Amino acid sequence: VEAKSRIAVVGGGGSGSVAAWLLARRHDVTLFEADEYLGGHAYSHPVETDQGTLHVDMGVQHFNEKLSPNLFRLLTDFGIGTYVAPSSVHVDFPGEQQSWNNLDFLGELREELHEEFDRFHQEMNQLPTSKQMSIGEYLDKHGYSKSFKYKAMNPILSIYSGCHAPSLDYNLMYVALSFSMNLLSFFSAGYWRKAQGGIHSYLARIESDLGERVRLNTPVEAVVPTQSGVTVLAGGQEHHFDQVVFATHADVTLRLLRTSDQQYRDLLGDFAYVPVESVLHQDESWLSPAGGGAYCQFRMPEGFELARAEEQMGSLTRNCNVLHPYRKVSSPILITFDPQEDVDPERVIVRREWKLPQLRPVDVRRKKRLHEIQGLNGLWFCGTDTSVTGHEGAIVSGMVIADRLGVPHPFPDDAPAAAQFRGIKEFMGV
Amino acid sequence: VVEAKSRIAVVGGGGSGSVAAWLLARRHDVTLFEADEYLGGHAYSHPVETDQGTLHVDMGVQHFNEKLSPNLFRLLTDFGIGTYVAPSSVHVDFPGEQQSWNNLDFLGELREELHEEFDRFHQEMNQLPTSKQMSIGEYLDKHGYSKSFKYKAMNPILSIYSGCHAPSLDYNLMYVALSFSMNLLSFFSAGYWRKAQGGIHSYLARIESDLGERVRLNTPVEAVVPTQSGVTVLAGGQEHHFDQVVFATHADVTLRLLRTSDQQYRDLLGDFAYVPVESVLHQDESWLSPAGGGAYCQFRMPEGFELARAEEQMGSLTRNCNVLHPYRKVSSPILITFDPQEDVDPERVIVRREWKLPQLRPVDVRRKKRLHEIQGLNGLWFCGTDTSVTGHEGAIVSGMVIADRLGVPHPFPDDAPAAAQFRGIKEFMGV
Ligand SMILES: Cc1cc2nc3c(=O)[nH]c(=O)nc-3n(C[C@H](O)[C@H](O)[C@H](O)COP(=O)(O)OP(=O)(O)OC[C@H]3O[C@@H](n4cnc5c(N)ncnc54)[C@H](O)[C@@H]3O)c2cc1C
Ligand SMILES: Cc1cc2nc3c(=O)[nH]c(=O)nc-3n(C[C@H](O)[C@H](O)[C@H](O)COP(=O)(O)OP(=O)(O)OC[C@H]3O[C@@H](n4cnc5c(N)ncnc54)[C@H](O)[C@@H]3O)c2cc1C
Ligand SMILES: CC(=O)O[C@@H](CC[C@H](C)CC[C@H](O)CC[C@H](C)CCNC(=O)[C@H](C)O)C[C@H]1O[C@H](O)[C@@H](C)C(=O)[C@@H]1C
Ligand SMILES: CC(=O)O[C@@H](CC[C@H](C)CC[C@H](O)CC[C@H](C)CCNC(=O)[C@H](C)O)C[C@H]1O[C@H](O)[C@@H](C)C(=O)[C@@H]1C
Ligand SMILES: [Ca+2]
The secondary structure of chain B, three-state, reads CCCCCCEEEEECCEHHHHHHHHHHCCCCEEEEECCCCCCECCCCEEEEEECCEEEEEECCCCCECCCCCHHHHHHHHHCCCCEEECCECEEEEECCCCEEEECCCCCCHHHHHHHHHHHHHHHHHHHCCCCCCCEHHHHHHHCCCCHHHHHHHHHHHHHHHHCCCCCHHHCEHHHHHHHHHCCCCCCCCCECCEEECCCCHHHHHHHHHHHHHHEECCCCEEEEEECCCCEEEEECCCEEEECEEEECCCHHHHHHHECCCCCHHHHHHCCCCEEEEEEEEECCHHHCCCCCCCCCEEEECCCCCCHHHCCCCCCEEEEEHHHCHHHCCCCCCCEEEECCCCCCCCCCEEEEEEEEEECCCHHHHHHHHHHHHHCCHHHEEECCHHHCCCHHHHHHHHHHHHHHHCCCCCCCCCCHHHHHHHHHHHHHCCC
Give the CA diameter of chain A.
69
Best residue among A58, A163, A248 to mutate for probing ligand 1, ranked by most atoms within 8 Å of CB: A248
Per the CB < 8 Å rule, is A122 touching B183?
no
In angstroms, what is the C-alpha Rg of chain B?
22
Q: How many cross-chain Cβ pairs, A to B, lie less than 8 Å apart?
A: 71
Alpha-carbon torsion, ordered A388, A390, A392, A398, to 10 deg: 70
A52 contacts A167 by C-beta, under 8 angstroms? no
Q: Which of B274, B248, B245, B207 is nearest to B398 (CA)?
A: B248
**Measured between alpha carbons, how far is residue A373 from residues A14, A52, A140 in Å?**
22, 49, 37
Strand A214-215 relative to strand A220-225, pairing: unpaired
Task: Give Cβ neighbours of residue B384 (< 8 Å, ≥ 6 apart).
Answer: B12, B14, B16, B17, B247, B248, B249, B250, B254, B395, B398
Residue A238 host element (H or E): strand A238-241
A119: helix, coil or strand? helix
Per the CB < 8 Å rule, is A182 touching B181?
no
Residue A281 host element (H or E): strand A273-281
- Ligand 1 binding site (Cβ under 6 Å of any ligand atom): A 10-16, 32-35, 40-42, 59-63, 219-220, 247-248, 252, 256, 276, 278, 354, 356, 383-384, 390-391, 394
Residue A266 host element (H or E): helix A263-268
Number of neighbours of residue A185 by Cβ within 10 angstroms: 27
A188 closest CB neighbour out of B190, B325, B328: B190
In terms of Cβ atoms closer than 10 Å to its own Cβ (0-12, 13-18, 19+), residue A328 is exposed
**Measured between alpha carbons, how far is residue A270 from residues A13, A160, A177, A370 in Å?**
22, 22, 26, 12
**A67 to chain B: nearest residue by CA?**
B126
Terminal CA-to-CA distance of chain B, rounded, Å? Answer: 14
Give the CA diameter of chain B.
69
B127 contacts B120 by C-beta, under 8 angstroms? no
Q: Which of A286, A342, A349, A356 is nearest to A55 (CA)?
A: A349
Between the CA of B395 and the centroid of ligand 2 the distance, in Å, is 8
Helix ranges (H only) for A83-148 are 108-126, 135-141, 146-148
- Calpha distance B166→B155 (Å, rounded): 9
Interface test with A, best of B81, B123, B330 (most A CBs within 10 A): B123
A187 closest CB neighbour out of B87, B105, B127: B87
What DSSP assignment string belongs to A24-81? Answer: TTTSEEEEE-SSSSSBTT--EEEEEETTEEEEEESS---B-TTT-HHHHHHHHHTT--
Count of helix runs (H) and strand runs (E) in chain A: 13, 19
Q: How far is A27 from chain B (nearest CA, A)?
A: 33
Q: Which of B385, B382, B363 is nearest to B60 (CA)?
A: B385
Q: Which atom of ligand 1 is nearest to the CA of A16?
A: 25
- Calpha distance B293→A55 (Å, rounded): 34
In terms of Cβ atoms closer than 10 Å to its own Cβ (0-12, 13-18, 19+), residue A32 is buried
B248 contacts B16 by C-beta, under 8 angstroms? yes
**B85 to chain A: nearest residue by CA?**
A118
A401 CB-side CA count, 13 A: 35
- Which residues from B are below 8 Å from A82, CB to CB? 123
Q: Which of A207, A215, A217 is nearest to A35 (CA)?
A: A217
Q: Which of B190, B86, B297 is nearest to A189 (CA)?
A: B190
Between the CA of B354 and the centroid of ligand 2 the distance, in Å, is 11
Strand A238-241 relative to strand A230-234, pairing: antiparallel
Strand A348-357 relative to strand A273-281, pairing: antiparallel
Task: Using alpha carbons only, give the angle A107, A110, A113 rounded to the nearest 5 degrees.
Answer: 150
Q: Using the 8-state DSSP alphabet, how is residue A300 labeled?
A: P
Task: Look up residue B357 and give its amino acid.
Answer: L
Binding site membership of A193 for ligand 3 (Cβ less than 6 Å): no
Strand B29-33 relative to strand B215-216, pairing: parallel
A183 contacts A160 by C-beta, under 8 angstroms? no
Binding site membership of A396 for ligand 3 (Cβ less than 6 Å): no
Which amino acid residue places its CA nearest to atom 27 of ligand 4?
B175
Peptide-bond breaks in chain A following residues (C–N over 2.5 A): 130
Phi/psi at B419 (5° precision): -65, -40
Between the CA of A139 and the centroid of ligand 5 the distance, in Å, is 26
Per the CB < 8 Å rule, is A188 touching B294?
no
A264 contacts A377 by C-beta, under 8 angstroms? no
- Calpha distance B160→B88 (Å, rounded): 9
Number of neighbours of residue B391 by Cβ within 10 angstroms: 19
Resolution reached, in Å?
Answer: 3.0
Which amino acid residue places its CA nearest to atom 23 of ligand 4?
B163
The residues facing A355 across adjacent strands are A275
- Calpha distance A63→A75 (Å, rounded): 11
A187 closest CB neighbour out of B67, B190, B328: B190
Terminal CA-to-CA distance of chain A, rounded, Å? Answer: 14
B108 CB-side CA count, 13 A: 27
Peptide-bond breaks in chain B following residues (C–N over 2.5 A): 131
- Calpha distance A328→A321 (Å, rounded): 9
Q: Which atom of ligand 2 is nearest to the CA of B12?
A: 44
- Calpha distance A120→A126 (Å, rounded): 10
Burial code of B302-320, b = ≥16 C-beta within 10 A, e = fewer? eeebeeeebeeebbbbbbb
Binding site membership of A153 for ligand 3 (Cβ less than 6 Å): no
- Which residues from B are below 8 Å from A415, CB to CB? 130-131
Between the CA of A14 and the centroid of ligand 1 the distance, in Å, is 7
**Measured between alpha carbons, how far is residue B420 from residues A402, B399, B427 in Å?**
38, 15, 10
A123: helix, coil or strand? helix
Binding site membership of B172 for ligand 4 (Cβ less than 6 Å): yes
- Which residues from A are below 8 Å from B66, CB to CB? 122, 125-126
Strand A82-84 relative to strand A238-241, pairing: unpaired
Task: Give Cβ neighbours of residue B263 (< 8 Å, ≥ 6 apart).
Answer: none
A229: helix, coil or strand? coil
User: How was it solved?
Assistant: X-ray
A213 CB-side CA count, 13 A: 27
Task: Give Cβ neighbours of residue B405 (< 8 Å, ≥ 6 apart).
Answer: B376, B381, B431
A188 closest CB neighbour out of B84, B181, B189: B189
Phi/psi at A392 (5° precision): -55, -45
Q: Which of A139, A179, A132 is nearest to A160 (CA)?
A: A179
Helix A200-210 / helix A69-77 crossing angle, nearest 10 deg? 60
In terms of Cβ atoms closer than 10 Å to its own Cβ (0-12, 13-18, 19+), residue A374 is middle
- Calpha distance B73→B203 (Å, rounded): 10
Interface test with A, best of B122, B188, B195, B321 (most A CBs within 10 A): B188
Q: Which of A72, A83, A75, A145 is nearest to A114 (CA)?
A: A145
Task: Give Cβ neighbours of residue A41 (< 8 Å, ≥ 6 apart).
Answer: A13, A14, A59, A60, A354
Q: Which atom of ligand 4 is nearest to the CA of B164?
A: 24
- Calpha distance B127→B138 (Å, rounded): 17
List residues of A whose CB lies inside 8 A of any B CB: 64-66, 82-84, 86, 103-105, 114, 117-118, 121-122, 125-126, 129-130, 180, 182, 185, 187-191, 293, 324, 327, 415-416
Strand A238-241 relative to strand B274-282, pairing: unpaired
- Calpha distance B416→B115 (Å, rounded): 39
**Measured between alpha carbons, how far is residue B15 from residues B89, B180, B204, B255, B400 in Å?**
27, 26, 8, 20, 11
- Calpha distance B425→B403 (Å, rounded): 13
Q: Which atom of ligand 1 is nearest to the CA of A355?
A: 53
A420 CB-side CA count, 13 A: 31
Task: Using alpha carbons only, give the angle B62, B67, B69 rounded to the nearest 5 degrees.
Answer: 45
- Calpha distance A313→A309 (Å, rounded): 8
Q: Which of A418, A52, A292, A391 is nearest to B105 (CA)?
A: A292
Q: Which of B421, B367, B340, B348 is nearest to B74 (CA)?
A: B421
Task: Look up residue B80 and give its amino acid.
Answer: G
- Calpha distance B335→B318 (Å, rounded): 7
The residues facing A246 across adjacent strands are A10, A381
Per the CB < 8 Å rule, is A191 touching B192?
no
**How would you list the strands of the sheet with B221-226, edge to edge?**
B221-226, B231-235, B239-242
